[PDB]
Design a protein around this nucleic acid. Structure first.
Ligand SMILES: [Mg+2]
Ligand SMILES: [Mg+2]
Ligand SMILES: [Mg+2]
Ligand SMILES: [Mg+2]
Ligand SMILES: [Mg+2]
Ligand SMILES: [Mg+2]
Ligand SMILES: [Mg+2]
Ligand SMILES: [Mg+2]
Ligand SMILES: [Mg+2]
Ligand SMILES: [Mg+2]
Ligand SMILES: [Mg+2]
Ligand SMILES: [Mg+2]
Ligand SMILES: [Mg+2]
Ligand SMILES: [Mg+2]
Ligand SMILES: [Mg+2]
Ligand SMILES: [Mg+2]
Ligand SMILES: [Mg+2]
Ligand SMILES: [Mg+2]
Ligand SMILES: [Mg+2]
Ligand SMILES: [Mg+2]
Ligand SMILES: [Mg+2]
Ligand SMILES: [Mg+2]
Lengths: 106, 62, 119, 62
RNA sequence: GAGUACGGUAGAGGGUGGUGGAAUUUCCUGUGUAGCGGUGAAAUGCGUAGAUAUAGGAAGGAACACCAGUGGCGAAGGCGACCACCUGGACUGAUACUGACACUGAGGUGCGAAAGCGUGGGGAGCAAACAGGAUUAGAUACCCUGGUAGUCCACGCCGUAAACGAUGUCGACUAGCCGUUGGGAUCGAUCUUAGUGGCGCAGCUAACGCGAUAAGUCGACCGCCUGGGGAGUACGGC
């Protein structure tokens, strides 16, 4: 497969099914044969500008292994959902597993 | 960025990135911070990439 | 006949190379009083001076004193003269200025501007 | 290009600080840049002339 | 000499999709009232049928501020928002491999800015033609107010530019100094490699100037010139 890194933020009013959406997304690539290397939930932050007239969002960061089929279906899931709001897919050449910032502030 | 940490500047580390943006929100020229050209290009792409995800503002006003 | 009261307003100065426009509104963007340089009796090359902007700002402030308006924030926008004479006239009216901001619109790539003049 | 009046300073410090911030942000330069269309040939010529003057001045310092 | 196999880097190299933010213009609505716009000065033009200004919402198109740099990539033309996919070349280190497999190139073939042409979409800004207002002896112009083809996209043609370094490609030698781009070594310094700039000894040049990125000293091959006009025109061919 290929390594991929995904940043995915969610509408604040839907920030209760986000976990379930996460394992639902993980499943499909698991039965496809993909892998999960890092999962991180550092959401409920303040936006730097208004996006679709909201000011908060729920951020999730996932590093995955997937093929073209799995990435395409996940990306369509991002396309036609209504809590997706915004998205970024940023393929890397390796695999990373140990945190980005979590909550550095005490 | 070559001494000990940050082999490649990351868009997620906002603490490093905010040190290279002015109060208006623009990218500071490399002739001021003394940053090397290659690392300056990495900062530029990291700042734009974080700007897309709304971690950093395009402009101070909005 | 009808009157109203309001405090903590916002004053917009719109400068240009030809004329300046002053508009006091409330915080919701509803105009109360306005004045210009062409309406103060200059009408020409004298219309494009900081003195005309000063006069316009004082006239607009005296017009807006009816509602009270003991507090004003300031929004300047434009490259023309009078970018600062209006701001110094507004406090001379008797106001108290919370802050000053510059809201000049800058395109990032935008549309293309007109041709260069061959004078 | 945005200041606040804080702790009863006179309205001469605030105005000059606002002017300094505006000069630092390069507002008027940006407005004068986009008044008319500068064809890319003229822009390249301006850049070349600026580079020539910059290098000559830098060399002359020693 | 020329090529191949193996790690690794840098990049506005190319193509196909998708998505951002700033700003302009139009439309709808609220506040509000007499000016706005433009100029060397004006006027045409826009406004009391409620403009300009200010606030909220929507549509649509095009160009990607800051980074940005005598910076980078490309055979040249040229290539600046971000992400994914397909894809070409260059640079860099060690070991192994083939064994002259090379250079140039009349015809020929292909790529080639902008304007332009054909069919079909699109229409914000700008703007040949065009109309009005000024200026003027006149003003088919410069300046102002508007504005159509065009500028954008898909496919096809056109094959020209001060398409310039006004400098054909390839290879070998010849004092040095100061920058900068992508890598290696040795102990911030020294060495070295492929690009990109400023000076300068010899040498060259009519002079200006070039000067390891030669216009120096030499080889291989190709293109071109023979006073200014008539003329890169007439006729014929493609
Ligand atoms: Mg004009
Ligand atoms: Mg309006
Ligand atoms: Mg609006
Ligand atoms: Mg040929
Ligand atoms: Mg064209
Ligand atoms: Mg055409
Ligand atoms: Mg025609
Ligand atoms: Mg046509
Ligand atoms: Mg058509
Ligand atoms: Mg027009
Ligand atoms: Mg056409
Ligand atoms: Mg020719
Ligand atoms: Mg020639
Ligand atoms: Mg040559
Ligand atoms: Mg050569
Ligand atoms: Mg040569
Ligand atoms: Mg040579
Ligand atoms: Mg020299
Ligand atoms: Mg000669
Ligand atoms: Mg002759
Ligand atoms: Mg002919
Ligand atoms: Mg003929």
């Amino acid at each position: 497969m290929r390594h991929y890194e995904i940043v995915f933020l969610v509408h604040p009013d839907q920030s209760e099914q986000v976990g379930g959406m996460v394992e639902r997304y993980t499943k499909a690539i698991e039965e496809d044969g993909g892998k999960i290397h890092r999962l991180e939930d550092w959401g409920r932050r303040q936006l730097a500008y208004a996006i679709n007239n909201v000011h908060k969002a729920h951020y999730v960061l996932m590093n995955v292994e997937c093929s073209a089929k799995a990435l395409a279906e996940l990306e369509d899931n991002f396309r036609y959902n209504d809590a997706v709001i915004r998205n970024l897919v940023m393929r890397r050449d390796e695999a990373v597993t140990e945190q980005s910032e979590m909550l550095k502030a005490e | 960025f070559t001494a000990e940490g940050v082999k490649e500047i990351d868009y997620k580390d906002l603490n490093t990135l905010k040190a290279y943006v002015s109060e208006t929100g623009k990218i500071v020229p490399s002739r001021i911070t003394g940053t090397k050209a290659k690392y300056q290009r990495q900062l530029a792409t990291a700042i734009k990439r974080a700007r897309y995800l709304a971690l950093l503002p395009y402009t101070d006003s909005h | 006949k009808v009157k109203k009261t309001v405090v903590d307003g916002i004053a917009h100065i719109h400068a240009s190379f030809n004329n300046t426009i002053v508009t006091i509104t409330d915080r919701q963007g509803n105009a109360l009083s306005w004045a210009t340089s062409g309406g103060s009796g200059f009408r020409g090359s004298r219309k494009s001076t900081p003195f005309a902007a000063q006069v316009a700002a004082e006239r607009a402030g005296q017009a807006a004193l009816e509602y009270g308006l003991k507090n004003l924030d300031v929004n300047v926008k434009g490259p023309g003269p009078g970018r600062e004479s209006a701001v110094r006239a507004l406090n001379a009216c008797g106001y108290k200025i919370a802050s000053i901001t510059d809201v000049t619109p800058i395109p990032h790539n935008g549309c293309r501007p007109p041709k260069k003049r061959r004078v | 290009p945005a200041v606040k009046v804080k702790e009863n300073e006179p309205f001469d410090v605030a105005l000059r600080r606002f002017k300094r911030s505006c000069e630092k942000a390069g507002v008027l330069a940006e407005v004068r840049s986009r008044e008319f269309y500068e064809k890319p040939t003229a822009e390249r010529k301006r850049k070349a002339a600026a580079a020539v003057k910059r290098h000559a001045k830098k060399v002359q310092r020693e």
